[PDB]
Amino acid sequence: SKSPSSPQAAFTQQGMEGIKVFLHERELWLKFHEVGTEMIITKAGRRMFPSYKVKVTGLNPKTKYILLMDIVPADDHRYKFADNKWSVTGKAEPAMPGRLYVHPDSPATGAHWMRQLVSFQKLKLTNNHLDPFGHIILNSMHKYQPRLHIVKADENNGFGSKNTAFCTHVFPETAFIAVTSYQNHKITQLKIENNPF
Amino acid sequence: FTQQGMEGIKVFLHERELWLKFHEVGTEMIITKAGRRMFPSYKVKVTGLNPKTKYILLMDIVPADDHRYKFADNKWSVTGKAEPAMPGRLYVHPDSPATGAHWMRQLVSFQKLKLTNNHLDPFGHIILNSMHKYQPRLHIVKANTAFCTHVFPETAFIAVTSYQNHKITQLKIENN
Ligand SMILES: [Mg+2]
Ligand SMILES: [Mg+2]
Ligand SMILES: [Mg+2]
């Protein structure tokens, strides 16, 4: 497994700088990344595989935090897959402001979040731009970067103030191309032989 | 989630192939009481800055996990749990505070940074514990404060009091 040519990046407001995030099963992610990761989108919605899970440290144990995820474009291109290669075949079709996925345990104390793995498996991806279930909407054959966001409560431990602050974190190895069906046989194979079932 | 004049910023790791080779073996960095420079040295090209407003460039070195490591039978392994994972000290780049175009004109070198194993060091060197894995981090602050941070995972390393791997100590030129 190569490492991604892009550094991990993070944007952090004061009060968040002690926090650290660790990608669960990073090597597994590196293998898909190496090949070029694809995620299937349907009208009903598909969960991601591999699923995005993180261990968090450095949270204030009884400050309240909101954990959420969004999936933003990584570039402005359409792609096609021919001759076992991804090529740029034109300009990305600008779309929705990205929806959020909020972790269902939010709001919660740092103690709660640090106690185990924050998992986002339940997050679903659709191609339907009229989705009525608040699923994340994506464009087939476009590249996307998942982002972690952590929101901290204020002194009264309650959001709605301007004394809230956030971490934003990006693992490059979790980037992927959305697809209505798999293109690279290696992706299709990695998923069958890593299928946790 | 509006990052300020900062979504455009990109960072590029210098002499990266060397970091990759060394990362593939398992990067080791010797720490001493007087303090050792990092090898490989840490240098980056910075792009996408507001051409000239004042920025401050920092580096910290933080735990990449919580394990203690042993090196046995030509291999690293987990062996226990580390001591403290922060609060730590920083290296503030000497050119700081300075301007975007300035920062962008020549490679930003962190070569003067040193690593010591003396918990009572008076020279501002970064204090590490041997046989613990660490992760160099780059922090950028535009002069209510906010950090853009860049982490190159291939610069992670285990801190040692002397080189361990025979692939380093018995360096084979036409091999690895
Ligand atoms: Mg010495
Ligand atoms: Mg030296
Ligand atoms: Mg020595």
Swiss-Prot record, chain A:
UniProt-recorded name of the protein: T-box transcription factor TBX5
Entry's disease: Holt-Oram syndrome: Developmental disorder affecting the heart and upper limbs. It is characterized by thumb anomaly and atrial septal defects.
Keywords: Acetylation, Atrial fibrillation, Cardiomyopathy, Cytoplasm, Developmental protein, Disease variant, DNA-binding, Nucleus, Transcription, Transcription regulation
Oligomeric and partner information: Monomer. Homodimer (via the T-box); binds DNA as homodimer. Interacts (via the T-box) with NKX2-5 (via the homeobox); this complex binds DNA. Interacts with GATA4. Interacts with KAT2A and KAT2B.
Tagged with keyword Cytoplasm: yes
Compartment(s) where it occurs, according to its Swiss-Prot or TrEMBL record: Nucleus; Cytoplasm
Impact noted for substituting residue 97 to S: Found in a patient with atrial fibrillation; uncertain significance; reduces transcriptional activity; affects transcriptional regulation of NKX2-5
Gene Ontology MF annotations: DNA binding; DNA-binding transcription activator activity, RNA polymerase II-specific; DNA-binding transcription factor activity; DNA-binding transcription factor activity, RNA polymerase II-specific; RNA polymerase II cis-regulatory region sequence-specific DNA binding; RNA polymerase II-specific DNA-binding transcription factor binding; sequence-specific DNA binding
GO cellular component: chromatin; cytoplasm; nucleoplasm; nucleus; protein-containing complex; protein-DNA complex; transcription regulator complex
Provenance organism: Homo sapiens
Any single GO BP term: atrioventricular node cell fate commitment
DNA-binding region location: 23-197
Effect of residue 108 to T: Found in a patient with sporadic dilated cardiomyopathy; uncertain significance; associated with significantly decreased transcriptional activity
Biased composition regions of type Low complexity, renumbered to the chain: 1-10
UniProt domain comment: The T-Box domain binds to double-stranded DNA.
Lineage: Eukaryota, Metazoa, Chordata, Craniata, Vertebrata
Keyword Transcription regulation assigned: yes
